[PDB]
RNA sequence: CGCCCGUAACGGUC
C-alpha cells in the first residue's frame, strides 16, 4: 500500500488523459 | 557484484532457474558461465531487454526460454507455458533499472541526456499506459507531494510539488531536462548540485523526484510484492531466492515478505551489501 | 541573508 493509492490516482490521470485526446 | 549472486544460487547440473529480471543478461550469462547443463527462464517487462533474452535463446537453444512481461503477469505466462508450481531450483530478482533505459535518452529516464518524459520500463508494449509526463501534468499538489515524499524519500516535497503545479499552469511538462529545471528552480541556484552520493559524488537535486516517478509510473512496489509471491509458489522446497534491493522500500518489502508480515516459510541464509538478501524456500 | 546535509529538543489533525 505505502500510503498512496494507484487505482484512485490512475482514473484521475485517465480523466485527464482523455480530455486531451 | 555479479559473481557473488551466482555464489548464492549454487547452480548445479540439471537444475532449472528463473531470472525474473533479465535486463542485459548479466546474471543469466553468469549462471551459464559457471555451469551450462541448466535451463534458465528469463523474464523482463522491458521489450528492449527481452529482445536480448530471445537473442540468446536462439543462441543457447536447449537452455534459455525467453519471456516478456511484468512481475504481476508472471503467474499467467508461467502457467500458460507449461510450468507447474514448485518447479524452480532458484529464482533471481535484480530490481532497479537496466542501463539500457537509463543511458538511451529516447526512453526518458536520465536527467543527464535529454529525452521525453517517458520513464516507462514497458516502453511501447502498452501505449495507453501513463508516462511520467502524464503524471506531473494531471495530479494535484497534495497527491504529487506524497508520491515524492514516500516513493522518492524527498524531504522538501511541498516545495517541489508547488514548483511543478505552477510551471504546469503555464506550459505542460514533456521532457526530462525541462522537469529537472522546474524542480531545481524551487531552490536557489546553490542547491542544484549540493547533495552527495554514497561515494561522495555530486548529484542533481531532481535525482529524488525522478526516482519517485520512476517507481510510481512503473508501480515498482506493488509489482514487487506480487512477484515475491509468484517466486515463492514456483520455487520448490529447498529452492533459493536471491533479491537485490536498491532503496529502503524495495528492501523493507522483501524483508517483511521473507519474515511473513504485511504491516516460518524461509531460511534466510545471506544478507550482504545496494543490499542483497537470499533465502531458501521450505 | 538564503540553501543543503546531519543532529536535537518542541506544539493542534490519521
Ligand atoms: N516490476 C518489474 N516487473 C518486470 N520487470 C522489471 C520490474 N522492475 C524492473 N524490471 C526489469 O529488471 C531489470 C533490472 C535491471 N537491473 C537488469 C538487471 C540484470 N541482472 C542485468 O544484467 O542488468 C530491468 O531491465 C527492468 O526492465
Residue numbers in the entry:
A (entry chain C): 2 to 22
B (entry chain D): 7 to 269, 304 to 313, 330 to 338
Task: Show passages lifted from the paper.
The METTL1570–407–RNA–hsRBFA226–260–SFG quaternary complex structure was subsequently refined to a resolution of 3.1 Å in space group C2221. In the structure of the quaternary complex, METTL15–RNA–hsRBFA226–260–SFG adopted a similar conformation to that in the METTL1570–407–hsRBFA226–260–SAM ternary complex, displaying an overall r.m.s.d. for Cα atoms of 0.475 Å. The helix of hsRBFA226–260 and the RNA substrate bound on either side of METTL15 domain2. Unexpectedly, both the 5’ end and the 3’ end of h44_dsRNA1 bases in the quaternary complex partially paired with the neighboring RNA in the next symmetry equivalent for better crystallization, respectively. Consistent with the previous FP assays, METTL15 interacted with the phosphodiester backbone of the RNA instead of the bases. The residues in the N-terminus of helix α7 and in the loop between helices α8 and α9 of METTL15 formed a positively charged channel to accommodate and recognize the RNA substrate. METTL15 His231, Lys234 and Arg270 formed several direct hydrogen bonds with the phosphodiester backbone of the RNA mainly via the positively charged side chain, while Phe262 and Pro263 recognized the phosphodiester backbone of the RNA via the hydrophobic interactions. The side chains of Pro263, Ala266 and Thr269 recognized the ribose of the RNA via the hydrophobic interactions.
The m4C methyltransferase METTL15 maintains mitochondrial homeostasis by catalyzing m4C839 located in 12 S rRNA helix 44 (h44). The domain 2 of METTL15 contained five α-helices and one η-helix, which formed a scaffold for the binding of RNA substrates or other functional proteins. Here, we reported a series of crystal structures of human METTL15–hsRBFA–h44–SAM analog, METTL15–hsRBFA–SAM, METTL15–SAM and apo METTL15.
